[PDB]
Amino acid sequence: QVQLVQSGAELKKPGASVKVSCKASGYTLSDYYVHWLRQAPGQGLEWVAWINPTSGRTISPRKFQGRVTMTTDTSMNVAYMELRGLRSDDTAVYFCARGGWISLYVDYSYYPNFDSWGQGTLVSVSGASTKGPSVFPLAPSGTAALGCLVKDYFPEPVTVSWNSGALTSGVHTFPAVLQSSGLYSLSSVVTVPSSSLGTQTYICNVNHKPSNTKVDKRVEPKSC
Amino acid sequence: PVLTQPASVSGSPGQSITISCTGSSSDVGSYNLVSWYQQHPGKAPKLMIYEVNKWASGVSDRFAGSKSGNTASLTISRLQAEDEANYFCSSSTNSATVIFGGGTKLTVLGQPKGAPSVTLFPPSSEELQANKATLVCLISDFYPGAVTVAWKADSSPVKAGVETTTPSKQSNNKYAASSYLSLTPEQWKSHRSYSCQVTHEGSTVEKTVAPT
């Protein structure tokens, strides 16, 4: 299908710069405008830019004009956004989205018609240092629920899959808890048939990009 | 500039509801380029209406856009519980930029209450081998999003090392929460049972575990 896949999450200290990539598939990047917007967590949407991949032409509001640099690499079907002078106000989820058809005869650049979005990229700015998570199996309690406990990490988010993406049904990943220590912890359960225990191998694949931590955990029934 | 929407809106199934988006003549008034997006909690926005009154793919006639002067309008008819989401208006400007509204949290009424599903997990052997213990209480599929959690060591309430998330809306318009009782392996073994109790409007549901 038509899909946009953005780069992993990032933790940056204030004053630094971040670079988010948006990788197109199912269509040619240079045929449509690329828009970039962001969303402070729990807040609203904020449009940051549009770019024509063919001409390189960009527009942004006055607020971002000095800080933002939009580019493209059509050879790889990729759009790039660099944000500079990072401040705590900049902590948000960043989306690239596909805009209107690029045409010689009509200008669709500022048309706010985003029919395809990227999954988002959480970039957080803070003085706190990154902490990788500790992952523990949650042994299975005609169905049963087994899971994974992801403990003590910073910043958000972590991504939890199962069987390297092979398992998709019955999976529930719960929102993380912010402990008083300033760290995050979450859990992710799968509800599987009780019969399949002892013969089907269940593995949670946990990924915390800001600390570059990739952990695969085999969850198996208790030692009984 | 910035577009202005009602911060929140409440509707009820069957009857219509209308969100407003008030802009200037230099954006909503000078273009037929108003788009409405719908967003569920964890997901990216989804294009509902574009160019004032045109439907995007996967949108029913229930949604209709309109424009009057400097004010766009998103009308929803035959309300459903799935329509519960945040709605953003957006327009082009004369500066060749795109402007967004603050977003409208719509709330569909007459939603049947739902009992919280509680699943309790004892500390893993591995975590115990890391000289720490954590009980995991997972709550799901409840509504409304108002829940209470009480941890229990044997028969005495616990308030030390609890940490509870605030309820957050799932896909199915229901809520989810989690509590994490953090203790030491010695504390874990110094009791005969631990219990996570969940109060959800009068009714409660609790689960238990035991180190043996």
Numbering used by the authors:
A (entry chain H): 1 to 141, 148 to 230
B (entry chain L): 2 to 213
What does the literature reporting this entry say, word for word?
The highly immunogenic third variable loop (V3) of the HIV-1 envelope protein (Env) is a plausible target of such efforts, but glycosylation at two or more V3-loop positions in the native trimer has limited the scope of previous work. We describe here a high-resolution crystal structure of “Man9-V3” bound with the single chain variable fragment (scFv) of the N332-glycan dependent bnAb, DH270.6. We have also determined a structure of the Fab of a clonally related member of this lineage, DH270.3 (11.8% mutated nucleotides and 42% neutralization breadth), in complex with a synthetic Man9 glycan. The mutated residues anchor DH270 lineage members onto the V3 loop GDIR region and contact the high mannose moiety of the N332 glycan.
Antibody DH270.3, in a different branch of the lineage than DH270.6, is both less potent against autologous and heterologous viruses and has a narrower neutralization spectrum. We determined a crystal structure of DH270.3 bound with a synthetic, biotinylated Man9 glycan. In the density map at 2.85 Å resolution, all of the Man9 sugar moieties were well resolved, and the refined model showed that they superpose well on the N332-Man9 glycan from our structure of DH270.6 bound with Man9-V3, except for the terminal mannose of the D2 arm, which does not contact either antibody. In contrast, the conformation of the V3 region, which is probably more rigid than the glycans, varies little from structure to structure. In any case, the DH270.3-Man9 structure confirms the contacts we observed between DH270.6 and the N332-glycan, and shows a conserved mode of glycan recognition by these clonally related antibodies. The one notable difference between the two structures is at D115H. This residue of the DH270.3 antibody forms a salt bridge with R98H, rather than the bidentate interaction with a terminal mannose seen in the DH270.6 complex. DH270.6 has threonine instead of arginine at position 98H. The mutation allowed the conserved residue D115 in the antibody heavy chain to interact favorably with the C-mannose moiety in the D1 arm of N332-Man9, while R98H and L48L, found in the UCA, DH270.3, and several early intermediates, anchor D115H in a rotamer that does not allow the glycan contact.
